[PDB]
Amino acid sequence: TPVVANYENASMAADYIKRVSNVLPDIGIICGSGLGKLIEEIEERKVIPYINIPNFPKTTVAGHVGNLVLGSVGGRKIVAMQGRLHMYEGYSNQEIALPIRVMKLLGVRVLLITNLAGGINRKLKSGDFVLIKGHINFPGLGLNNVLVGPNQDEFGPRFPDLSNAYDRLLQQLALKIAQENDFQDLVHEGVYAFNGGPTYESPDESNMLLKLGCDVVGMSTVPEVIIACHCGIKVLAVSLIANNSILDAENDVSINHEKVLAVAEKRADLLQMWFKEIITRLPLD
Amino acid sequence: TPVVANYENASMAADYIKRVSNVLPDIGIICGSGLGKLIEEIEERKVIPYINIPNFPKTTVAGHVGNLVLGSVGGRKIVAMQGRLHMYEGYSNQEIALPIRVMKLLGVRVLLITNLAGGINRKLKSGDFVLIKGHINFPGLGLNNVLVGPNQDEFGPRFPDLSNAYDRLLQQLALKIAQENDFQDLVHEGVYAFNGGPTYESPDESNMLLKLGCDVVGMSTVPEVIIACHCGIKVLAVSLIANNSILDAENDVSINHEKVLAVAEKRADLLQMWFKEIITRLPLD
Amino acid sequence: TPVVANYENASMAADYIKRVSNVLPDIGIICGSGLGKLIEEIEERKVIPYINIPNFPKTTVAGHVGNLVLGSVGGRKIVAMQGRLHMYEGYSNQEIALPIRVMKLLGVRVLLITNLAGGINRKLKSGDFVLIKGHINFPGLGLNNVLVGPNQDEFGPRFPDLSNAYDRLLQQLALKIAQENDFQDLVHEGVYAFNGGPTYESPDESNMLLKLGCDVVGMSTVPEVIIACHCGIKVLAVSLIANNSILDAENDVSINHEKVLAVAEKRADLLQMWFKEIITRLPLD
Numbered sequence: 001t002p003v004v005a006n007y008e009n010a011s012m013a014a015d016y017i018k019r020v021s022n023v024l025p026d027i028g029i030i031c032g033s034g035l036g037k038l039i040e041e042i043e044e045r046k047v048i049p050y051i052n053i054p055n056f057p058k059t060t061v062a063g064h065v066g067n068l069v070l071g072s073v074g075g076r077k078i079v080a081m082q083g084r085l086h087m088y089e090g091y092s093n094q095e096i097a098l099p100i101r102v103m104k105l106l107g108v109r110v111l112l113i114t115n116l117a118g119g120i121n122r123k124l125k126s127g128d129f130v131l132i133k134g135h136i137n138f139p140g141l142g143l144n145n146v147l148v149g150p151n152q153d154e155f156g157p158r159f160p161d162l163s164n165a166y167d168r169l170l171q172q173l174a175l176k177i178a179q180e181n182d183f184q185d186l187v188h189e190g191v192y193a194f195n196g197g198p199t200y201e202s203p204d205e206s207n208m209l210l211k212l213g214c215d216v217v218g219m220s221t222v223p224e225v226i227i228a229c230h231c232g233i234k235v236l237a238v239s240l241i242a243n244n245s246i247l248d249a250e251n252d253v254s255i256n257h258e259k260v261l262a263v264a265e266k267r268a269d270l271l272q273m274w275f276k277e278i279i280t281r282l283p284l285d
Numbered sequence: 286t287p288v289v290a291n292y293e294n295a296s297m298a299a300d301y302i303k304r305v306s307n308v309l310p311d312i313g314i315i316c317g318s319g320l321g322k323l324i325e326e327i328e329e330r331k332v333i334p335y336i337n338i339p340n341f342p343k344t345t346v347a348g349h350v351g352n353l354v355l356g357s358v359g360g361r362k363i364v365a366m367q368g369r370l371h372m373y374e375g376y377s378n379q380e381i382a383l384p385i386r387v388m389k390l391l392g393v394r395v396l397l398i399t400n401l402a403g404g405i406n407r408k409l410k411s412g413d414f415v416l417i418k419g420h421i422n423f424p425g426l427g428l429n430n431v432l433v434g435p436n437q438d439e440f441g442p443r444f445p446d447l448s449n450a451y452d453r454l455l456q457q458l459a460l461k462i463a464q465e466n467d468f469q470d471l472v473h474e475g476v477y478a479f480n481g482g483p484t485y486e487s488p489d490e491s492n493m494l495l496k497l498g499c500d501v502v503g504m505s506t507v508p509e510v511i512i513a514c515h516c517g518i519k520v521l522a523v524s525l526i527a528n529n530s531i532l533d534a535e536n537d538v539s540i541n542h543e544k545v546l547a548v549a550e551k552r553a554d555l556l557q558m559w560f561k562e563i564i565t566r567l568p569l570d
Numbered sequence: 571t572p573v574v575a576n577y578e579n580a581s582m583a584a585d586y587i588k589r590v591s592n593v594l595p596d597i598g599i600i601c602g603s604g605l606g607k608l609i610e611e612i613e614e615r616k617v618i619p620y621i622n623i624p625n626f627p628k629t630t631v632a633g634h635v636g637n638l639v640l641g642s643v644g645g646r647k648i649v650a651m652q653g654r655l656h657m658y659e660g661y662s663n664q665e666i667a668l669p670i671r672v673m674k675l676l677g678v679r680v681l682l683i684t685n686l687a688g689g690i691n692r693k694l695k696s697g698d699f700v701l702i703k704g705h706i707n708f709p710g711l712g713l714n715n716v717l718v719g720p721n722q723d724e725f726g727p728r729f730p731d732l733s734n735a736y737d738r739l740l741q742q743l744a745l746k747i748a749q750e751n752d753f754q755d756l757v758h759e760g761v762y763a764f765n766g767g768p769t770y771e772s773p774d775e776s777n778m779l780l781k782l783g784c785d786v787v788g789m790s791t792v793p794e795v796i797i798a799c800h801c802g803i804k805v806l807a808v809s810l811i812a813n814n815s816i817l818d819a820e821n822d823v824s825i826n827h828e829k830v831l832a833v834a835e836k837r838a839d840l841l842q843m844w845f846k847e848i849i850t851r852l853p854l855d
């Protein structure tokens with residue numbers, strides 16, 4: 001239609017997934033542009049095309065990969081979205097919410113998210129990591145919040161509070177692992193601005209974001225964070241900085257997706273190892 | 286469809302209402318969360334379910350009460366919306382506009398509005414009242430203004446000016462009545478930020494709103510104000526402060542709808558008496 | 571449907587236009603409110619109603635003029651939109667994009683745009699011109715960017731960079747011509763804030779825009795700029811200042827479309843002469 005991300009429809013998708021894999025996952029992962037290699041290293045993995053799963057959103061107009069992958073990483077049972085849904089593609093609120101709510105029904109209690117983002121804070125360099133500690137949701141302020149529509153009461157409340165959407169203990173664990181491996185000099189914390197996209201933030205938008213307290217800006221993540229928070233899934237979200245948009249504005253330097261993907265390639269293996277250790281270590285609560 | 290909030294469709298609804306009640310109302314009221322008790326005290330009242338009124342928006346997906354109530358308060362003929370339409374539910378621009386335009390055709394020249402809101406200004410405490418003197422309409426800046434769509438010329442102009450949307454004399458009368466009853470220490474004036482919702486403003490969004498000159502933030506009111514202003518209805522809008530979001534961000538205190546409704550209960554009777562006196566006193570122009 | 575602004579649909583419209591006119595235009599023009607007289611002075615002109623062109627957006631609900639006009643100005647072949655499409659009317663992303671993509675297929679490599687706007691910068695007076703050097707796209711930040719939807723790869727990339735959307739050489743040429751004619755005292759440069767509309771920026775929104783680095787605010791232009799930039803068309807965009815919204819807020823002065831059109835009439839002939847000279851002079855690259 002697209003179908004509504006309701007209890008019945010999410011249950012039908014979860015039923016199918018449980019029949020095709022015997023994996024009851026505890027952790028969900030959604031990976032940023034060029035940051036998906038960990039999904040290829042899931043052990044005893046089961047690849048389920050979105051197109052095979054009842055009620056999953058149609059992704060053939062955008063094309064490219066679209067699989068749910070289940071298996072084990074670091075002794076833990078996980079489910080990954082291989083082929084992230086971005087709202088700049090035109091996916092509706094219901095299409096974004098359904099896969100996360102299916103994760104919830106499958107057993108997911110922690111969602112780990114990566115993205116590629118532009119740096120606003122002057123401290124940030126290309127290749128740095130930012131642990132996201134809060135956000136500025138321009139679509140949400142502007143009546144395009146991912147939860148606009150009827151509330152699905154079986155998943156969560158009509159009015160979620162987002163002040164604890166980014167779990168503090170998970171940020172602390174991520175930082176501890178970076179310190180153990182001596183890459184903590186790459187790791188910052190910051191506020192993520194959600195630019196709906198798909199045009200990169202303009203130079204004057206970047207300057208505005210700096211004035212408003214934003215540390216990084218990107219086109220993803222906040223919708224999934226909100227759906228997860230609504231249904232009680234804890235979240236860790238990490239941005240990989242492709243560029244510093246404030247410096248680029250001052251120096252008339254352009255940004256493009258090829259530059260973004262080159263930064264992703266430069267940090268992909270380190271991010272994979274970091275997230276593998278996070279998965280192995282995160283409290284089995 | 287939903288139907289268009291045009292002259293013909295609004296007239297058909299008004300025709301029905303005039304046949305079911307002999308009340309020609311001069312004043313409209315729309316009440317905030319937990320602030321609806323005055324509607325139950327309308328004298329010689331006629332309760333008309335929205336579902337009975339031709340062209341009124343369907344509200345059964347959200348459920349809960351949805352009635353138009355007509356009768357007398359303080360010697361004046363009034364019409365109330367019992368069960369407010371909020372845009373975070375997914376109601377379209379046409380669905381929001383039609384009931385206000387029906388009010389206009391029925392004779393309404395003044396619309397009184399209450400809401401529950403978060404405090405941004407550091408002066409504001411839970412339980413305070415804010416007379417709204419202007420707004421920052423994030424949905425409107427972002428192409429979700431309630432007037433996006435064809436203009437309905439019979440109601441108003443293509444490009445309304447909102448600099449006089451909140452009538453100054455009505456604010457002055459509201460304040461005078463608070464002074465007469467010695468609760469003026471609870472009363473402030475301020476700029477209302479419209480957060481489309483339904484998630485509460487995040488801590489970092491609250492900090493941004495402070496920087497931008499916002500005094501309070503909420504998820505309602507601005508759409509109705511704009512439809513009223515477009516068709517020449519004067520507006521008084523009063524926010525009841527549920528919490529101070531800036532202090533809550535500094536102290537890691539959460540907000541939820543149960544806390545909101547508890548503040549509503551604490552001030553409901555005083556707000557009812559205040560608005561009853563406003564209705565009784567507001568100039569019969 | 572509206573139809574998708576894809577390669578096939580834009581080609582069908584271009585085919586029709588090429589059959590009805592033998593004009594292969596190099597320059598496109600889109601003119602602001604009351605600023606369309608140059609279109610009436612196109613030489614050897616061919617007027618093609620939008621309603622006659624396959625796949626052009628339906629504009630009969632809004633009504634008013636809607637023609638594509640082709641011919642010669644200053645020795646150059648041009649195509650003009652007579653009757654601009656504004657997103658506050660409810661036109662979709664596909665409806666806005668199709669005419670610009672048709673321009674691209676017809677041969678357009680430079681798009682000249684005028685608009686009427688409110689002044690935010692304190693230096694700006696009614697009747698001044700602002701060469702637009704960048705923008706703040708509130709709809710784009712808020713998930714209403716004109717490119718939301720599937721990417722049309724034949725026209726441009728999924729993620730455009732807008733740092734060079736407003737050609738610097740074209741701004742320099744426009745300014746040089748103003749200096750040659752001794753009206754450079756009217757000409758400024760500035761950042762344009764896109765208010766989706768159709769309500770004028772409220773006084774408190776104007777104050778916010780000043781804090782955020784905006785020089786002017788209006789309800790058009792940015793969507794066309796983005797579609798042009800996406801498909802490699804260079805842009806010059808010039809705002810005519812109808813009023814200073816910051817001064818109006820301080821002095822409680824209203825704005826309305828009649829005042830806007832009166833400023834347009836006061837500068838229409840000078841703007842026509844300026845743009846005619848720009849067309850004549852702009853580099854035949």
Ligand SMILES: O=P(O)(O)O[C@H]1O[C@H](CO)[C@@H](O)[C@H]1O
Binds near residue numbers: 220
């Ligand atoms: O956020 P992720 O998925 O990493 O992708 C980011 O990189 C792409 C732009 O280069 C956009 O998709 C943006 O959201």
Ligand SMILES: O=P(O)(O)O[C@H]1O[C@H](CO)[C@@H](O)[C@H]1O
Binds near residue numbers: 369503504541
């Ligand atoms: O504005 P009112 O109708 O009072 O309701 C406000 O309170 C609720 C959130 O607690 C939201 O509906 C918000 O808009």
Ligand SMILES: O=P(O)(O)O[C@H]1O[C@H](CO)[C@@H](O)[C@H]1O
Binds near residue numbers: 444601603654687791
């Ligand atoms: O931008 P142009 O087309 O000049 O029109 C501007 O003037 C009108 C408001 O007065 C709006 O249409 C605004 O966009």
Ligand SMILES: Nc1ccnc(=O)[nH]1
Binds near residue numbers: 118195243255
């Ligand atoms: N500069 C950016 C890089 C990647 N993603 C963004 O949204 N912005």
Ligand SMILES: Nc1ccnc(=O)[nH]1
Binds near residue numbers: 402403
């Ligand atoms: N803090 C808040 C209370 C009530 N409504 C809001 O929107 N925000």
Ligand SMILES: Nc1ccnc(=O)[nH]1
Binds near residue numbers: 688689825830
């Ligand atoms: N003040 C204004 C004049 C014209 N257009 C606008 O958007 N604003």
